[PDB]
Design an enzyme around this catalytic site. Structure first.
Site, PDB file in Angstrom:
ATOM      1  N   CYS A 131       8.027 -36.592  -5.261  1.00 49.97           N
ATOM      2  CA  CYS A 131       7.765 -36.979  -5.141  1.00 49.97           C
ATOM      3  C   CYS A 131       6.882 -37.572  -3.689  1.00 49.97           C
ATOM      4  O   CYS A 131       6.420 -38.843  -3.306  1.00 49.97           O
ATOM      5  CB  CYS A 131       8.871 -37.788  -3.957  1.00 49.97           C
ATOM      6  SG  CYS A 131      10.979 -38.306  -4.938  1.00 49.97           S
ATOM      7  N   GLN A 132       6.295 -36.419  -3.055  1.00 51.06           N
ATOM      8  CA  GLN A 132       5.398 -36.623  -2.706  1.00 51.06           C
ATOM      9  C   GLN A 132       4.251 -37.226  -3.075  1.00 51.06           C
ATOM     10  O   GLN A 132       3.387 -36.771  -3.543  1.00 51.06           O
ATOM     11  CB  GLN A 132       5.223 -35.148  -1.877  1.00 51.06           C
ATOM     12  CG  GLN A 132       4.746 -35.280  -0.328  1.00 51.06           C
ATOM     13  CD  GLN A 132       3.916 -34.053   0.324  1.00 51.06           C
ATOM     14  OE1 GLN A 132       4.054 -32.574  -0.611  1.00 51.06           O
ATOM     15  NE2 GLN A 132       3.950 -34.352   1.835  1.00 51.06           N
ATOM     16  N   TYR A 263       0.642 -29.898  -9.079  1.00 51.03           N
ATOM     17  CA  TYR A 263       0.718 -29.272  -7.768  1.00 51.03           C
ATOM     18  C   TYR A 263       0.758 -27.448  -7.461  1.00 51.03           C
ATOM     19  O   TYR A 263       0.989 -27.181  -9.072  1.00 51.03           O
ATOM     20  CB  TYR A 263       1.054 -29.637  -6.835  1.00 51.03           C
ATOM     21  CG  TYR A 263       0.401 -31.583  -6.567  1.00 51.03           C
ATOM     22  CD1 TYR A 263      -0.389 -31.855  -5.954  1.00 51.03           C
ATOM     23  CD2 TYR A 263       1.187 -32.344  -6.836  1.00 51.03           C
ATOM     24  CE1 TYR A 263      -1.002 -32.955  -5.243  1.00 51.03           C
ATOM     25  CE2 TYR A 263       1.209 -33.747  -6.385  1.00 51.03           C
ATOM     26  CZ  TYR A 263      -0.254 -33.769  -6.123  1.00 51.03           C
ATOM     27  OH  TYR A 263      -0.661 -35.013  -5.770  1.00 51.03           O
ATOM     28  N   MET A 266       5.468 -27.645  -3.818  1.00 50.43           N
ATOM     29  CA  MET A 266       6.153 -28.886  -3.370  1.00 50.43           C
ATOM     30  C   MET A 266       7.604 -27.931  -2.967  1.00 50.43           C
ATOM     31  O   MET A 266       8.196 -27.154  -3.759  1.00 50.43           O
ATOM     32  CB  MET A 266       6.529 -29.909  -4.277  1.00 50.43           C
ATOM     33  CG  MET A 266       7.357 -30.740  -3.680  1.00 50.43           C
ATOM     34  SD  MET A 266       6.322 -30.939  -2.827  1.00 50.43           S
ATOM     35  CE  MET A 266       7.924 -32.162  -1.228  1.00 50.43           C
ATOM     36  N   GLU A 267       7.312 -27.711  -1.653  1.00 49.03           N
ATOM     37  CA  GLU A 267       8.244 -27.454  -0.413  1.00 49.03           C
ATOM     38  C   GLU A 267       9.789 -27.978  -0.641  1.00 49.03           C
ATOM     39  O   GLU A 267      10.813 -27.828   0.182  1.00 49.03           O
ATOM     40  CB  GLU A 267       8.028 -27.278   1.047  1.00 49.03           C
ATOM     41  CG  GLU A 267       8.272 -28.134   1.615  1.00 49.03           C
ATOM     42  CD  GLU A 267       6.144 -28.868   1.497  1.00 49.03           C
ATOM     43  OE1 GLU A 267       5.340 -29.237   0.860  1.00 49.03           O
ATOM     44  OE2 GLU A 267       6.721 -29.843   1.803  1.00 49.03           O
ATOM     45  N   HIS A 291       3.541 -20.257   1.747  1.00 43.93           N
ATOM     46  CA  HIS A 291       3.175 -21.668   2.349  1.00 43.93           C
ATOM     47  C   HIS A 291       4.277 -22.420   2.402  1.00 43.93           C
ATOM     48  O   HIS A 291       4.605 -22.871   2.604  1.00 43.93           O
ATOM     49  CB  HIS A 291       2.105 -22.116   1.296  1.00 43.93           C
ATOM     50  CG  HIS A 291       1.420 -23.405   1.870  1.00 43.93           C
ATOM     51  ND1 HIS A 291       0.178 -23.942   2.617  1.00 43.93           N
ATOM     52  CD2 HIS A 291       2.097 -24.868   1.305  1.00 43.93           C
ATOM     53  CE1 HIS A 291       0.203 -25.269   2.690  1.00 43.93           C
ATOM     54  NE2 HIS A 291       1.283 -25.669   1.785  1.00 43.93           N
ATOM     55  N   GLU A 292       4.760 -22.088   1.283  1.00 46.02           N
ATOM     56  CA  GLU A 292       6.128 -22.904   0.392  1.00 46.02           C
ATOM     57  C   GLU A 292       7.039 -22.369   1.687  1.00 46.02           C
ATOM     58  O   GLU A 292       7.674 -23.068   1.953  1.00 46.02           O
ATOM     59  CB  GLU A 292       6.813 -23.046  -0.838  1.00 46.02           C
ATOM     60  CG  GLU A 292       5.456 -23.172  -2.137  1.00 46.02           C
ATOM     61  CD  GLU A 292       4.917 -24.517  -1.689  1.00 46.02           C
ATOM     62  OE1 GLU A 292       5.416 -25.673  -0.834  1.00 46.02           O
ATOM     63  OE2 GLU A 292       4.059 -25.008  -2.049  1.00 46.02           O
ATOM     64  N   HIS A 295       6.739 -24.177   5.062  1.00 44.57           N
ATOM     65  CA  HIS A 295       7.251 -25.631   5.277  1.00 44.57           C
ATOM     66  C   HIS A 295       8.741 -25.638   6.263  1.00 44.57           C
ATOM     67  O   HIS A 295       8.606 -26.951   5.753  1.00 44.57           O
ATOM     68  CB  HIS A 295       7.347 -26.412   3.653  1.00 44.57           C
ATOM     69  CG  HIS A 295       5.917 -26.905   4.023  1.00 44.57           C
ATOM     70  ND1 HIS A 295       5.423 -27.710   4.296  1.00 44.57           N
ATOM     71  CD2 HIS A 295       4.610 -26.455   3.032  1.00 44.57           C
ATOM     72  CE1 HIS A 295       3.598 -28.092   4.374  1.00 44.57           C
ATOM     73  NE2 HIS A 295       3.925 -27.695   3.184  1.00 44.57           N
ATOM     74  N   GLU A 314       0.469 -29.801   7.123  1.00 42.23           N
ATOM     75  CA  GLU A 314      -0.204 -28.933   6.307  1.00 42.23           C
ATOM     76  C   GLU A 314      -0.844 -27.760   7.055  1.00 42.23           C
ATOM     77  O   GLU A 314      -1.088 -26.587   6.600  1.00 42.23           O
ATOM     78  CB  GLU A 314      -1.280 -29.600   5.633  1.00 42.23           C
ATOM     79  CG  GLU A 314      -0.550 -30.506   4.452  1.00 42.23           C
ATOM     80  CD  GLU A 314       0.440 -29.825   3.857  1.00 42.23           C
ATOM     81  OE1 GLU A 314       0.451 -28.687   3.400  1.00 42.23           O
ATOM     82  OE2 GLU A 314       1.068 -30.199   3.344  1.00 42.23           O
ATOM     83  N   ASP A 371      -2.141 -40.489  -3.078  1.00 38.83           N
ATOM     84  CA  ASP A 371      -2.833 -39.781  -3.651  1.00 38.83           C
ATOM     85  C   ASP A 371      -4.486 -39.656  -3.819  1.00 38.83           C
ATOM     86  O   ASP A 371      -4.662 -38.508  -4.722  1.00 38.83           O
ATOM     87  CB  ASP A 371      -1.987 -39.755  -5.483  1.00 38.83           C
ATOM     88  CG  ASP A 371      -0.565 -39.425  -5.092  1.00 38.83           C
ATOM     89  OD1 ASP A 371      -0.055 -39.580  -4.434  1.00 38.83           O
ATOM     90  OD2 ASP A 371       0.176 -40.757  -6.155  1.00 38.83           O
ATOM     91  N   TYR A 379      -5.346 -29.586   4.874  1.00 36.73           N
ATOM     92  CA  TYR A 379      -5.189 -27.932   4.962  1.00 36.73           C
ATOM     93  C   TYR A 379      -5.944 -27.795   5.747  1.00 36.73           C
ATOM     94  O   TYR A 379      -5.420 -26.437   7.445  1.00 36.73           O
ATOM     95  CB  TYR A 379      -5.322 -27.802   3.516  1.00 36.73           C
ATOM     96  CG  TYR A 379      -3.676 -28.216   2.834  1.00 36.73           C
ATOM     97  CD1 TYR A 379      -4.278 -29.385   2.007  1.00 36.73           C
ATOM     98  CD2 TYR A 379      -2.334 -27.701   2.786  1.00 36.73           C
ATOM     99  CE1 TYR A 379      -3.608 -29.853   1.387  1.00 36.73           C
ATOM    100  CE2 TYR A 379      -2.155 -27.723   1.552  1.00 36.73           C
ATOM    101  CZ  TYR A 379      -2.392 -29.237   1.545  1.00 36.73           C
ATOM    102  OH  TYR A 379      -1.572 -29.072   0.340  1.00 36.73           O
TER     103      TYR A 379
HETATM  104  C1  LIG Z   1      -5.061 -36.495   4.464  1.00 37.48           C
HETATM  105  C2  LIG Z   1      -5.166 -36.884   2.916  1.00 37.48           C
HETATM  106  C3  LIG Z   1      -4.073 -37.210   2.467  1.00 37.48           C
HETATM  107  C4  LIG Z   1      -2.772 -37.575   3.235  1.00 37.48           C
HETATM  108  C5  LIG Z   1      -1.123 -37.947   2.409  1.00 37.48           C
HETATM  109  N1  LIG Z   1      -1.386 -38.266   0.911  1.00 37.48           N
HETATM  110  C6  LIG Z   1      -0.509 -37.223   0.355  1.00 37.48           C
HETATM  111  C7  LIG Z   1      -0.824 -37.454  -0.797  1.00 37.48           C
HETATM  112  C8  LIG Z   1       0.490 -36.474  -1.564  1.00 37.48           C
HETATM  113  C9  LIG Z   1       1.251 -35.869  -1.092  1.00 37.48           C
HETATM  114  O1  LIG Z   1       1.841 -34.714  -1.838  1.00 37.48           O
HETATM  115  C10 LIG Z   1       1.837 -33.935  -2.613  1.00 37.48           C
HETATM  116  C11 LIG Z   1       1.778 -32.745  -3.409  1.00 37.48           C
HETATM  117  C12 LIG Z   1       0.701 -31.593  -2.975  1.00 37.48           C
HETATM  118  C13 LIG Z   1       1.832 -30.570  -2.823  1.00 37.48           C
HETATM  119  C14 LIG Z   1       3.085 -31.630  -2.636  1.00 37.48           C
HETATM  120  N2  LIG Z   1       2.907 -32.343  -3.395  1.00 37.48           N
HETATM  121  C15 LIG Z   1       0.783 -35.291   0.082  1.00 37.48           C
HETATM  122  C16 LIG Z   1       0.397 -36.362   1.396  1.00 37.48           C
HETATM  123  C17 LIG Z   1      -3.129 -37.533   4.398  1.00 37.48           C
HETATM  124  C18 LIG Z   1      -4.473 -36.845   4.795  1.00 37.48           C
HETATM  125 ZN   LIG Z   2       1.623 -27.720   2.425  1.00 40.61          ZN
END
Ligand SMILES: c1ccc(CNc2ccc(OC[C@H]3CCCN3)cc2)cc1
Ligand SMILES: [Zn+2]
Ligand SMILES: [Yb+3]
Ligand SMILES: [Yb+3]
Ligand SMILES: [Yb+3]
Length: 606
Positions: A131-132, A263, A266-267, A291-292, A295, A314, A371, A379
């Site tokens: 979902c993230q 990825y 995912m935590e 890391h996880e 979180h 992050e 995305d 990070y």
């Molecule tokens: C810099 C770069 C991206 C963003 C927001 N975009 C974003 C896109 C996907 C994300 O989660 C996807 C994956 C990453 C590891 C677990 N899920 C999380 C954030 C904000 C600031």
């Molecule tokens: Zn993370």
């Protein structure tokens, strides 16, 4: 929240979700009802707006009667807003339940549906979610913003031979009354979470206990290997608990997914999702677990209010991760990893360009698909800021004191950069004059590498740099001096850093790379980080023998950290270009929806 079309938390907030659904593999649809317990934050509230993406709405029921709703026009990667007409106006703080009958699209961006051949066992299909950041709306109608925290319960009907797992404590199972070829799994998440933390997997899963509060879950064929790889898990939890305060989630389980998981990890609360590319045979990629685990405090307790503030999640999580790894393996190793990370930041800044908006620590996501913005910047620039503050403010013991206070202070909340900065200044009020030396505007709002580089212990990095330098400055007549013994005293991590050092100067002459294979036999290393970087170096150095190896790794797993640059390298190499786009076109339909999207953009295909 510029990434959400829902009513903001100033208007109303979801407190609870009850999800009842059935996972239909024949139609690749999830069908059911989401009962959202919503609380008004306003006087005389008469409508509210939800996020959706490719959902089919059957009906909306409040107080036992169907009600008016409308779906607005699709706004690209944001999906379509769903306005709901409340049958009775709500006063401030009043709560009601809104129950939405819905069905997902097979093409849901939150979900990957796998055929039996795409799994280990080859008998059963498999489903997983991710979902993230903003794909929860592609599963169920919700306010799809991390600025809202809700608890949830679920009941999930699945073919009786399969297993359902979610980001929640398992609450039992029974045959389905409505169809005895099915089972219903039930789940409770009693800690308020942002909706991006809602997760489901359904497959032929087994578990093995590896700690007092940890089961590892995978298909049968990976269980033994996973149990060994992740055996440091409990000891990392104990250290994380020392650093962040109590672990509040009860269970810490691990799910090892099929190779297309997009990825590293995912935590998901109660059940971390990891890539199988972690299964190196020696625990050497365990930093991802740390890391996880981290979180569970930074991200899952203190959450970013919007995605502009993603670095909060992050940076703090990388900072705790490197501390856990420092505890286990020594402070020199924390510095080695810290310096490696700075090197990964130079790479991302160079890739995007040094005035690119995505290289800003705090980003403005207005009109940006999250995305597409995703990278190592939050990070590593985030970690570098905190590592610099550590050194500015008196060392790691002092800064860990702030980190623990920071967690307590914002537990169960969603916060911004200014909330964090404000708390930082409050916590270190006796060191405010030191804090006033930080170029905040540069660190937070400017593109490119940070204005200041922290100090790093070099002990473990030196041999990596010395060897990288030997190869780069070597001429033809120096190639003979290289030998398998050069690697003698290098750990897997140092081989990786050696390769990263050298990759930073790619291409190298093709004769050098061939020699490197002749003497180091890098082709035989199955460590995914090492092999990744080595194959990139081969392709960038125009070694045609490396082409089928790089095609094979890009498509045999789907971790985007590896699959995206391998495809991009292959398309930049003229001898492999057509093959790269050929391969993508063939695999596209069976790829993860987001992976397929991003690789296509990277290759400029469609
Ligand atoms: C810099 C770069 C991206 C963003 C927001 N975009 C974003 C896109 C996907 C994300 O989660 C996807 C994956 C990453 C590891 C677990 N899920 C999380 C954030 C904000 C600031
Ligand atoms: Zn993370
Ligand atoms: Yb009123
Ligand atoms: Yb129970
Ligand atoms: Yb203040």
């Amino acid at each position: 929240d510029t990434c959400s079309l829902a009513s903001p938390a100033s208007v109303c907030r979801t407190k609870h979700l009850h999800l009842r659904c059935s996972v239909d593999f024949t139609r690749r649809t999830l069908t059911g009802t989401a009962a959202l317990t919503v609380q008004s934050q306003e006087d005389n509230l008469r409508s509210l707006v939800l996020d959706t993406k490719d959902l089919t709405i059957e009906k909306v029921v409040i107080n036992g009667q169907e009600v008016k709703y409308a779906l607005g026009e699709r706004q690209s990667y944001k999906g379509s807003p769903m306005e709901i007409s409340l049958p009775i106006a709500l006063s401030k703080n009043q709560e009601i339940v809104i129950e939405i009958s819905f069905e997902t699209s097979p093409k849901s961006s939150a979900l990957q549906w796998l055929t039996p051949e795409q799994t280990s066992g080859k008998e059963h299909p498999y489903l997983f979610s991710q979902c993230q950041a903003i794909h929860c709306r592609a599963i169920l109608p919700c306010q799809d913003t991390p600025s809202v925290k809700l608890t949830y319960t679920a009941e999930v009907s699945v073919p009786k031979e399969l297993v359902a797992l979610m980001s929640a404590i398992r609450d039992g199972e029974t045959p389905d009354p409505e169809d005895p070829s099915r089972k219903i799994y039930k789940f409770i998440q009693k800690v308020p979470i942002p909706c991006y933390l809602i997760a489901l997997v359904v497959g032929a899963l087994e578990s093995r206990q590896i700690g007092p509060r940890t089961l590892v879950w995978s298909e049968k064929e990976q269980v033994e290997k996973s149990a060994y790889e992740f055996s440091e898990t409990e000891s990392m939890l104990k250290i994380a608990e020392d650093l962040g305060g109590p672990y509040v989630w009860g269970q810490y389980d691990l799910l090892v997914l099929p190779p297309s998981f997009p990825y590293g990890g995912m935590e998901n609360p109660c059940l971390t999702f990891v890539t199988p590319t972690l299964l190196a045979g020696d625990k050497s990629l365990s930093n991802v677990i740390a890391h996880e685990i981290s979180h569970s405090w930074t991200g899952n307790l203190v959450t970013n209010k919007t995605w502009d503030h993603f670095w909060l999640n992050e940076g703090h999580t990388v900072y705790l991760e490197r501390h856990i790894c420092g505890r286990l393996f020594g402070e020199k190793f924390r510095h080695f990893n810290a310096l490696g990370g700075w090197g990964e930041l130079q790479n991302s800044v160079k890739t995007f360009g040094e005035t690119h908006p995505f290289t800003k620590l705090v980003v403005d996501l207005t009109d940006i698909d999250p995305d597409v913005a995703y990278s190592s910047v939050p990070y590593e620039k985030g970690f570098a800021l905190l590592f610099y503050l550590e050194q500015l403010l008196g060392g790691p013991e002092i800064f860990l004191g702030f980190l623990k206070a920071y967690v307590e202070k914002f537990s169960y909340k969603s916060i911004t950069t200014d909330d964090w900065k404000d708390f930082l200044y409050s916590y270190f009020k006796d060191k405010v004059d030191v804090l006033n030396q930080v170029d905040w505007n540069a660190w937070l709002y400017s593109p490119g590498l940070p204005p200041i580089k922290p100090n790093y212990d070099m002990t473990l990095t030196n041999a990596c740099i010395a060897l990288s330098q030997r190869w780069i400055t070597a001429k033809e007549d120096d190639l003979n001096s290289f030998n398998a013994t050069d690697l003698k005293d290098l750990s897997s991590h140092q081989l990786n850093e050696f390769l990263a050092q050298t990759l930073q100067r790619a291409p190298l002459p093709l004769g050098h790379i061939k020699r490197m294979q002749e003497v180091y036999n890098f082709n035989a290393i199955n460590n995914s980080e090492i092999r990744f970087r080595w194959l990139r170096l081969c392709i960038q150095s125009k070694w045609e023998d490396a082409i089928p190896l790089a095609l094979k790794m890009a498509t045999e797993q789907g971790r985007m950290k590896f699959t995206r640059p391998l495809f991009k390298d292959l398309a930049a190499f003229d001898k492999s270009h057509d093959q790269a786009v050929r391969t993508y076109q063939e695999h596209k339909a069976s790829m993860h929806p987001v992976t397929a999207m991003l690789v296509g953009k990277d290759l400029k295909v469609d």
